[PDB]
Amino acid sequence: SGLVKMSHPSGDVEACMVQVTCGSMTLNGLWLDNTVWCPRHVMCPADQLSDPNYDALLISMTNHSFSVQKHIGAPANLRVVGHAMQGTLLKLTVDVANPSTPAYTFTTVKPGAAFSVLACYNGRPTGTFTVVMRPNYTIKGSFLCGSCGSVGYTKEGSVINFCYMHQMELANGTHTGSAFDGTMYGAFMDKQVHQVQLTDKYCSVNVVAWLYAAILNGCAWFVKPNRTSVVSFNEWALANQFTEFVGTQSVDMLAVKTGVAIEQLLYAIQQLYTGFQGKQILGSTMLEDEFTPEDVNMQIMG
Amino acid sequence: SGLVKMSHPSGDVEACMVQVTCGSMTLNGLWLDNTVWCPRHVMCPADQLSDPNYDALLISMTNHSFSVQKHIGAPANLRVVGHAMQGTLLKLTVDVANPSTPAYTFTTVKPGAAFSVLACYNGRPTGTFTVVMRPNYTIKGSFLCGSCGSVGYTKEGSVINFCYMHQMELANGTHTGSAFDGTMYGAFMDKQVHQVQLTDKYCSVNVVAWLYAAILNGCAWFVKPNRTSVVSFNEWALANQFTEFVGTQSVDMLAVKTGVAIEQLLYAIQQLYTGFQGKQILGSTMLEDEFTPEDVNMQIMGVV
Ligand SMILES: CCC(=O)Nc1ccc(N(Cc2ccsc2)C(=O)Cn2nnc3ccccc32)cc1
Ligand SMILES: CCC(=O)Nc1ccc(N(Cc2ccsc2)C(=O)Cn2nnc3ccccc32)cc1
């Protein structure tokens, strides 16, 4: 028993991190087969960060402008033999296929979804943590300058789903990046300018997941017979900083195992939003929305 | 910027996990060169869990009573060619040295200290998280049956400090295990019998660390000129379920970077623990004590 923030084992991804340097700029990249992905602002000189002409910058580059070093677990000398730009990413081609490339996919995650981040500096992995893609297409991470190119991922069986490459800090403790299709989450621009963020919201389906966890750990005081329909909850949510609740098969399994219906928890949420009346739930005096239904099924029930 | 719960990259340790089997019983083990470590309760029949005679169980076994297998990386079986017990652990000698053995040492963690855990089932890594050794020598983890033998560690340079091997659940969300000298944290017994816990406490020096993190992240409303000396804080702590505060150079560095004195934060804690009066600190409405001084220096200052 117990529920805590958990990340995927990082070994597979660690073996894929490298350093990328272009002029006076260096950061992290991801080495999959013959490709090395990194943020394109690695091209950008310090005096143009607030207004990069990425088209011009790409034109000025040759394969010799890029230095790619493997700093852990290999005597790998990596020659760049091709370079291209795909959205906010660079795609560099190298003359050697990463012998430790995992089975993998590229997937764009939606709000409320969780993934593991492998924080990296100069191609050296330093730490791992889990984040949720906030409803405003930010994440709440722990990143310092030099962490760009750190990757985010999930894992289904042996397959690694790469879904995030770290790009920028937007405000204290507020970060964003792109999917590997090159699209930036939240459409934030990779320029050094201040950019307004939309309002954050409680991830309703994750709060339900978390309450199911509570019930399965013997904490069920908030459960009453009373129910609120999905439809009525979703109207209330719009007025009260909650996302729309969409049920999944993962949520339904928690309902089955506990015998407590989703609609009882939607009711509970409307009562708990008002406050906990001096009580707690799994050690918290506030609603938690960074535990997903899948995460709870994994941790409570295997 | 940002402060999150952070664990060590786990790849080094992943390559050392195996499954240990003793008849109908199975759990996880740690393969370092020639030796496989695992909990000795792998030997105990359901029959006997409440009152196990481990000495008697050991002599009833031969090398053939055990087997080991490697699931991650290149799969293999590892033949057992010797067996021994050290405290609450077995040391099984196997016929192949782990070719991916890291540099490591065996340490014992003290209360308030943090380490990473690699949760494993059937010798397969499933997740990682970070815990603090509570003042009552438990940790607050996430473990299912089958997770026994999962390890906890920290890392200095290349050297992995193995400090924990998971043994048992004591109560809901409450766990303990042993150090690799075989001694159980808190001197809990590896027996299925109820055992009372000592009182858990707020880890004061960690709470101080987290308030510094807050200040460094633009959250400093609780900072006032008011102070409380350490000694006077510590007399207060005895009475209000806080640990004795002991300063360290790690803490001192944070004081300097922020220009806010430990004593000011000790005063703040005395006000905050009754509640934040509707305000928030790093998104929390309660004191957080699982962020260590060293962890905050690393995450925010970049210093290790
Ligand atoms: C040539 C040397 C150099 O320093 N380049 C550079 C690159 C990126 C950034 N930006 C802003 C931005 C975005 C697109 S273009 C510029 C970050 O947000 C970097 N960043 N990412 N996570 C951070 C966390 C803390 C501080 C800075 C952080 C700043 C500087
Ligand atoms: C197949 C036979 C079998 O079940 N053996 C067995 C071994 C250990 C335990 N105990 C208690 C204990 C200790 C020494 S002797 C008994 C745990 O706390 C196991 N444990 N560890 N983390 C857990 C998390 C949830 C449930 C049980 C957990 C329970 C059962």
Side-chain angles (χ1 to χ4, degrees):
Chain A
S1 76
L3 185 76
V4 309
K5 301 209 162 175
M6 208 177 280
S7 302
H8 293 279
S10 55
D12 290 338
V13 177
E14 288 167 50
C16 288
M17 302 310 296
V18 297
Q19 180 175 23
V20 182
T21 293
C22 179
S24 319
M25 185 44 195
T26 183
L27 42 57
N28 306 276
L30 177 68
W31 183 22
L32 303 179
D33 300 313
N34 282 96
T35 304
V36 173
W37 302 89
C38 70
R40 59 174 189 177
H41 66 65
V42 72
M43 281 186 309
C44 188
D47 75 323
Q48 291 168 35
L49 288 163
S50 281
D51 197 22
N53 188 322
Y54 282 113
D55 291 326
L57 290 162
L58 180 64
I59 290 172
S60 75
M61 298 309 147
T62 78
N63 297 339
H64 273 212
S65 330
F66 301 102
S67 177
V68 179
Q69 297 172 63
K70 178 73 152 58
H71 276 343
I72 53 131
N77 265 274
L78 264 48
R79 291 195 66 258
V80 179
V81 303
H83 65 276
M85 189 169 61
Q86 186 179 310
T88 57
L89 298 183
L90 271 167
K91 190 174 176 174
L92 305 177
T93 310
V94 295
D95 73 337
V96 294
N98 184 354
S100 307
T101 308
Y104 78 88
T105 65
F106 290 150
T107 198
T108 303
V109 299
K110 290 168 188 61
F115 62 86
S116 296
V117 174
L118 182 60
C120 293
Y121 297 83
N122 300 312
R124 306 168 165 85
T126 62
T128 194
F129 49 100
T130 296
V131 302
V132 159
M133 177 64 57
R134 302 310 304 174
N136 61 2
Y137 297 93
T138 70
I139 63 171
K140 305 298 195 71
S142 188
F143 297 107
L144 306 175
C145 65
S147 62
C148 299
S150 292
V151 311
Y153 59 99
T154 58
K155 185 182 298 193
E156 274 193 347
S158 71
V159 188
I160 292 169
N161 326 118
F162 292 115
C163 62
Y164 181 96
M165 171 158 289
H166 185 55
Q167 291 263 9
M168 74 197 66
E169 181 157 309
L170 298 170
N172 294 348
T174 309
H175 309 102
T176 198
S178 58
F180 279 80
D181 64 356
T183 314
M184 193 77 69
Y185 286 100
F188 289 100
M189 314 183 270
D190 44 352
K191 312 184 309 196
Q192 182 169 75
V193 299
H194 177 80
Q195 310 174 59
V196 68
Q197 302 117 72
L198 299 177
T199 87
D200 208 340
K201 291 179 184 209
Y202 289 92
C203 294
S204 312
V205 68
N206 291 347
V207 176
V208 170
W210 172 71
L211 290 177
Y212 274 126
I215 293 153
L216 289 164
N217 278 271
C219 176
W221 61 261
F222 51 86
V223 180
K224 308 285 201 267
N226 313 78
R227 303 177 172 225
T228 302
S229 69
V230 171
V231 163
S232 309
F233 178 86
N234 278 355
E235 301 173 357
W236 172 90
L238 282 178
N240 286 288
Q241 314 172 91
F242 275 80
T243 53
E244 161 176 312
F245 179 88
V246 188
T248 70
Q249 291 177 25
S250 189
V251 183
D252 301 334
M253 289 194 283
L254 290 170
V256 168
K257 321 320 299 172
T258 61
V260 180
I262 285 169
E263 292 81 358
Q264 293 176 257
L265 297 188
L266 293 183
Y267 181 91
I269 287 169
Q270 297 174 305
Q271 307 313 302
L272 294 171
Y273 184 62
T274 314
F276 285 22
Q277 321 302 320
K279 303 151 188 186
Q280 60 174 4
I281 303 174
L282 285 176
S284 198
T285 49
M286 68 175 81
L287 297 173
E288 304 289 349
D289 76 341
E290 297 227 342
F291 300 98
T292 72
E294 294 88 354
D295 192 15
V296 173
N297 275 278
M298 191 251 298
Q299 282 193 51
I300 312 305
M301 323 207 313
Chain B
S1 77
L3 183 78
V4 304
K5 290 224 86 177
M6 199 171 297
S7 311
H8 289 291
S10 58
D12 275 358
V13 181
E14 282 172 56
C16 303
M17 304 306 306
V18 294
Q19 176 176 33
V20 181
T21 308
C22 181
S24 39
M25 281 77 70
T26 187
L27 44 56
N28 310 274
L30 183 76
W31 181 29
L32 300 173
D33 287 306
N34 238 23
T35 302
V36 172
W37 304 82
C38 75
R40 66 181 179 170
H41 71 54
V42 74
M43 294 189 300
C44 186
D47 202 276
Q48 296 168 43
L49 291 165
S50 85
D51 187 31
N53 184 345
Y54 287 109
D55 310 275
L57 280 168
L58 187 55
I59 54 177
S60 71
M61 305 286 173
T62 76
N63 289 328
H64 286 317
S65 310
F66 305 97
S67 59
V68 182
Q69 53 188 350
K70 220 280 184 176
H71 295 296
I72 313 309
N77 288 283
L78 307 174
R79 185 175 131 255
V80 178
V81 297
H83 66 279
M85 186 169 66
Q86 165 170 4
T88 62
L89 299 177
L90 302 173
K91 296 167 60 174
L92 304 172
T93 309
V94 293
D95 64 338
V96 183
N98 189 348
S100 295
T101 306
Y104 66 90
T105 60
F106 294 141
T107 69
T108 294
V109 293
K110 303 186 191 184
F115 57 97
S116 287
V117 173
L118 189 63
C120 296
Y121 302 81
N122 297 319
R124 291 183 170 79
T126 63
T128 182
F129 54 93
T130 294
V131 294
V132 159
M133 184 57 60
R134 304 305 309 172
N136 61 0
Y137 296 97
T138 60
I139 63 169
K140 297 306 204 76
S142 173
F143 295 106
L144 301 183
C145 61
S147 75
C148 298
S150 297
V151 302
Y153 52 101
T154 53
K155 196 174 185 209
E156 305 183 38
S158 293
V159 186
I160 296 161
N161 315 125
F162 288 114
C163 62
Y164 181 92
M165 172 163 279
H166 179 49
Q167 292 266 5
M168 63 193 75
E169 182 160 307
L170 299 169
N172 186 254
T174 307
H175 309 107
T176 203
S178 55
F180 276 80
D181 68 350
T183 80
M184 190 84 66
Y185 283 102
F188 292 102
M189 289 181 291
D190 53 339
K191 286 195 296 194
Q192 185 141 74
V193 175
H194 173 83
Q195 300 168 84
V196 67
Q197 296 164 43
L198 293 185
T199 182
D200 198 3
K201 286 171 179 201
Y202 287 101
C203 298
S204 295
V205 69
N206 292 346
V207 178
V208 160
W210 171 79
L211 294 179
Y212 278 129
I215 292 166
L216 287 159
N217 271 259
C219 178
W221 60 261
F222 54 84
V223 175
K224 294 294 195 265
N226 307 72
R227 279 152 131 259
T228 300
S229 65
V230 175
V231 304
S232 155
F233 174 77
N234 283 338
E235 297 171 5
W236 179 80
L238 285 166
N240 291 280
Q241 297 206 93
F242 272 75
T243 51
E244 189 203 1
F245 173 96
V246 190
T248 76
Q249 284 191 317
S250 205
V251 183
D252 289 343
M253 271 183 235
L254 294 176
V256 178
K257 176 63 187 190
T258 60
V260 182
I262 288 167
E263 281 81 12
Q264 298 179 258
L265 291 194
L266 298 179
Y267 178 80
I269 286 159
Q270 301 177 312
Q271 312 313 322
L272 295 169
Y273 84 112
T274 47
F276 295 168
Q277 296 270 318
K279 298 163 165 138
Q280 282 191 10
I281 300 183
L282 285 162
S284 183
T285 58
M286 41 190 302
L287 299 181
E288 299 292 341
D289 74 341
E290 301 231 333
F291 299 101
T292 61
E294 293 83 11
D295 188 19
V296 178
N297 270 288
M298 177 270 303
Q299 281 194 60
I300 286 182
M301 320 264 290
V303 306
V304 184

